[PDB]
Amino acid sequence: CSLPFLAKICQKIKLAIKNSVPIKDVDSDKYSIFPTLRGYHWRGRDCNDSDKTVYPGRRPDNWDAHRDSNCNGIWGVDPKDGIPYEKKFCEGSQPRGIILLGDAAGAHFHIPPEWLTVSQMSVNSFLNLPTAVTNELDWPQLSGTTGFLDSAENSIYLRLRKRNRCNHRDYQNISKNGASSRNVKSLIESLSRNQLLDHPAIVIYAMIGNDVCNGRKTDPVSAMTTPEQLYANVLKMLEALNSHLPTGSHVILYGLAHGAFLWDTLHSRYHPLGQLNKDVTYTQLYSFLGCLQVSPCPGWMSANETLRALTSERAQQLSETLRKIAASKKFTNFNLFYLDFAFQEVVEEWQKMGGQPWELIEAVDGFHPNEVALLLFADQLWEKVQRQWPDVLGKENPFNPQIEEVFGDQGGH
Amino acid sequence: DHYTCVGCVLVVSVIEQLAQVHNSTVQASMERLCSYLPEEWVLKTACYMMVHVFGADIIKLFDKDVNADVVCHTLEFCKQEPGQPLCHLYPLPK
Ligand SMILES: *O[C@H]1[C@H](O)[C@@H](NC(=O)C[C@@H](CCCCCCCCCCC)OC(=O)CCCCCCCCCCCCC)[C@H](OC[C@H]2O[C@H](*)[C@H](NC(=O)C[C@H](O)CCCCCCCCCCC)[C@@H](OC(=O)C[C@H](O)CCCCCCCCCCC)[C@@H]2O)O[C@@H]1CO[C@]1(C(=O)O)C[C@@H](O)[C@@H](O)[C@@H]([C@H](O)CO)O1
Ligand SMILES: *[C@@H]1O[C@H](CO[C@@H]2O[C@@H](C)[C@@H](O)[C@@H](O)[C@@H]2O)[C@@H](O[C@@H]2O[C@H](CO)[C@@H](O)[C@H](O)[C@H]2NC(C)=O)[C@H](O)[C@H]1NC(C)=O
Ligand SMILES: *[C@@H]1O[C@H](CO)[C@@H](O[C@@H]2O[C@H](CO)[C@@H](O)[C@H](O)[C@H]2NC(C)=O)[C@H](O)[C@H]1NC(C)=O
Ligand SMILES: *[C@@H]1O[C@H](CO[C@@H]2O[C@@H](C)[C@@H](O)[C@@H](O)[C@@H]2O)[C@@H](O)[C@H](O)[C@H]1NC(C)=O
Ligand SMILES: CCCCCCCCCCCCCC(=O)O
Ligand SMILES: [Ca+2]
Ligand SMILES: [Ca+2]
Ligand SMILES: [Ca+2]
């Protein structure tokens, strides 16, 4: 990238990444007809990419008598009574979208172990490589909050769609691998919601590790976000959200991860690259990446158990700061809730299904929750919110069967 | 630099382990690896091109069987940076 003509190309690419909006977006409404490059793997597919006033989550102009302005597949008029279908079937159902402000776990970062495990490698092992790369090695379309494809327990979005079919396609995964409270402001800008013209939304803020997982070149403890910084960062983010979200929205602050689980579970187990000759464990992976100063979480991926404990203590302190914000600060356009990171519940749910805890962590990176873990976290969030704050999720739409009868798959995803 | 080291160790690891499971040379496993890439993106073509043009020149640097850490340090993909410890993923002999 140092060559002069080639560098102007490199700068342009990085610029597309960082803005976190689809590259294929003719009307610039941040929704795409193409899946990757921040396309409809990440947000609802644009049912008209030639019209910035047609996109998922919109309130339906004229009740969508003439066209499907919010891409939920419901539109037209019932010739029988002259009533628009979306008024008949959705008026009063309180639709809402789901928006994730998250990190690599929320984007569902995953390197296929098939790319690195020769014992099973074949012509089929790399067919997914171009999709994965142009999705920044994330798989939002299979994630726990916004997934909509056949899971390799289903996603928050699909549960919302099941509760009220009018929510079809109203998902947005605004997650970035390196996101934390320190940079969530750039994500707020890539979000799509008009406070007056769109449906309300559930926004989950789930930065579960990066505020304690920096420090790749210094004492990690000195690099971690402090409670005062996070308080300020999140407050400013919430104030910004208050100007985007329609009245009747809901914001959930999710606590940080129990990252000590990683070393405890994996330090003696073999990495995929170590399986053939039984010569690489996660201990060596963690040392290797740390030595190269590219560790994704030096504080928790350490053999120094004092460092791990300090990292966990900061994580708990930052989670208590989120809980304090939710208990003490109020915003006109949304209700605000805090939820703890449901570590014990997920691990117990998994063990009762016959699982082993090491099966919950991405095999290649030894860091992120994997697809199963993410759907278990989604299940625990759904049930807990349903039990405590059922208003957040809304009522079941009694006209879901009518919607299905008249509109079928509602245009698919 | 710290990324090229990681990427080199990953790629060389796969090449070496793929050779091991087939009792093959490194040239044969490199070609086998390209064989597995998808046609899209000119990956398989770029791969094959890379292997034929430079492969042998790279293998000829080695009169001994050595692991991926050694290969990648020799090719200067893993450099010993001033003030930083030597990095390696696999066990050291002795
Ligand atoms: O320029 C910016 C940097 O790019 C940016 N770094 C990135 O964000 C990290 C990227 C770099 C990608 C390099 C490799 C590219 C090739 C990928 C294509 C795949 C080809 C197949 O990395 C990634 O995000 C992960 C990529 C892993 C790729 C592995 C592929 C394996 C496939 C095997 C193929 C074999 C075939 C046979 C930098 O950001 C600063 C920090 O920001 C936070 C970020 N943290 C997160 O992203 C953490 C998140 O949870 C993701 C963790 C992923 C861990 C993967 C482990 C894999 C182990 C594999 C087994 C051994 C930090 O990043 C890291 O934590 C990521 C980690 O370090 C990477 C580990 C392994 C790399 C392997 C490379 C393999 C190469 C391909 C092999 C062929 C970031 O450090 O920021 C700079 C710009 O910066 C600054 C600025 O200049 O202004 C300065 C900063 O200090 C900072 O201040 C910010 C400011 O704050 C902004 O305001 O900006
Ligand atoms: C997607 O929308 C385009 C554009 O819609 C027109 O322009 C918008 C900005 C808005 O003003 C809409 O009300 C307009 O209908 C549609 O393209 C137009 O379609 C009509 C035929 O119904 C035709 O008169 C125009 O020539 C078309 N093109 C333009 C540039 O106006 C298009 O049909 C929509 N696609 C789908 C699948 O519904
Ligand atoms: C375990 O990690 C901790 C935290 O990084 C280390 O504590 C630091 O020790 C160095 C001295 O070598 C000082 O720079 C800091 O004052 C310490 N940090 C804190 C927060 O007290 C500790 O040295 C590590 N232990 C081992 C055996 O490596
Ligand atoms: C091949 O090499 C064998 C030793 O390697 C082991 O067995 C082979 C089949 C692979 O699975 C490899 O990964 C193992 O480490 C020898 O036993 C055998 O004699 C060799 N084959 C020939 C034809 O010489
Ligand atoms: C014998 C084969 C040698 C293997 C070479 C693979 C090198 C991978 C380089 C990784 C890319 C680094 C990206 C970056 O610098 O940002
Ligand atoms: Ca669009
Ligand atoms: Ca549109
Ligand atoms: Ca509609």
From Swiss-Prot, chain B:
Glycans are attached at residue 23. Residues 1-82 form the Saposin B-type domain. Residues 2-34 are annotated as: Important for enzyme activity, localization to cytoplasmic vesicles, and protein stability. Disulfide bonds join 5-78, 8-72, 34-47. It comes from the Eukaryota. This is Acyloxyacyl hydrolase small subunit. It comes from Oryctolagus cuniculus.
